[PDB]
Amino acid sequence: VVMTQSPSTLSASVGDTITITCRASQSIETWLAWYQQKPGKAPKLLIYKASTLKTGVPSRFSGSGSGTEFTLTISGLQFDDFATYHCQHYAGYSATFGQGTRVEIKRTVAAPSVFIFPPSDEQLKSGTASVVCLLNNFYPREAKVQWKVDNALQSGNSQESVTEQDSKDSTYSLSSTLTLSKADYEKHKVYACEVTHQGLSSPVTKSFNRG
């Protein structure tokens, strides 16, 4: 059995009634559960056997369906409900999950505002160089950052982190850190962060020259 959820990201406003769909590749009767999960927390069972609400779960959550097509409905979205929802077929020994649906607060598309930061000489004195790229206040969450050093496209030497939706404007921000030793850093001049996002008509590059 393969489980597929639709959509992958659902954007809505507070108070909305929204529906998430879950499809099974073959009939699973009503052996279907729905879980809610917040970032860094445990999944929480909401509904099972397709339509049974777990005791204590608010009545605005409801489930329906049987066979291959299932729906989770949230009737009147509250701020607490923006989270990931997972569907699950559970059998006697194993289980299988859908890919998850992220429910987010809808806003207009916003292109990232891009900034690049050289390493401090205070750090560089210690023997390491962290180069930071900031992608600020963008929406939706999908964005791509690549590092170039003297026009050379880099691989495997960066890490990325993303915020949750901003409490005031519902955007996301992203930081990418390129880490090199002092010695490797001083071997090159041009440091550049290149960014794409659906809100940009062409890639944005920010750069600095070492020293």
Binding site: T196, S201, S202, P203
Partner: protein
């Protein structure tokens, strides 16, 4: 600056009512020098325009310019060649692209209908196959219809070069096993340069 030439769709040049066209696309036209000049040639003639028709747009961090040349069904079917010449000040020399139907004598496509395998009619849905072989060039169009309407759950493989040098493909229509048994009749329509009125048709039933 890149340039891609696109030919008309197989059906466009087969039906006098349709409108066949050759499209010239230019991507990555820098923001600085957005000037783009198109020159069209039909067998090397027309440096002096023709129907022609450009527009202008903006993207990622470059420009995209599209020019459209409407062609004459018989000019295309008669193998005429279409050249799109793209000149840009930010270019060392102009870039030229040319397209036409593949060279070669047109072979008539043989269209056969193939009912499902006994071992499949044990499933809720079966496969009605339509074989189209020995055609050339590869330009071709396939469709399905059961009654006075199109069947929309079918797929056609892309054409495949046979040992003949001619082309062959298969279109697979998927029908609810329940229907095929109700004695329903289906048919695939094939449209090709080498078919009578650029069209033939074959039926398939459960008798």
């Amino acid at each position: 600056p890149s340039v891609f030439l696109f030919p008309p769709k197989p059906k466009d040049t087969l039906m006098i009512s349709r409108t066949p066209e050759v499209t010239c696309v230019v991507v990555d036209v820098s923001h600085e020098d957005p000037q783009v000049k198109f020159n069209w040639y039909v067998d090397g003639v027309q440096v002096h325009n023709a129907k022609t028709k450009p527009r202008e747009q903006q993207y990622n961090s470059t420009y995209r310019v599209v020019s459209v040349l409407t062609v004459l069904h018989q000019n295309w079917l008669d193998g005429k060649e279409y050249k799109c010449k793209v000149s840009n000040k930010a270019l060392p020399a102009p870039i030229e692209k040319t397209i036409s139907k593949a060279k070669g004598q047109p072979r008539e496509p043989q269209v056969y209908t193939l009912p499902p395998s006994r071992e499949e009619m044990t499933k809720n849905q079966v496969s009605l196959t339509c074989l189209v072989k020995g055609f050339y060039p590869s330009d071709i169009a396939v469709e399905w219809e059961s009654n006075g309407q199109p069947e929309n759950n079918y797929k056609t493989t892309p054409p495949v070069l046979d040992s003949d040098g001619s082309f062959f493909l298969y279109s697979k229509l998927t029908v609810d096993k329940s229907r095929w048994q109700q004695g329903n009749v289906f048919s695939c329509s094939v449209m090709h340069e080498a078919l009578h009125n650029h069209y033939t048709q074959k039926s398939l039933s459960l008798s």
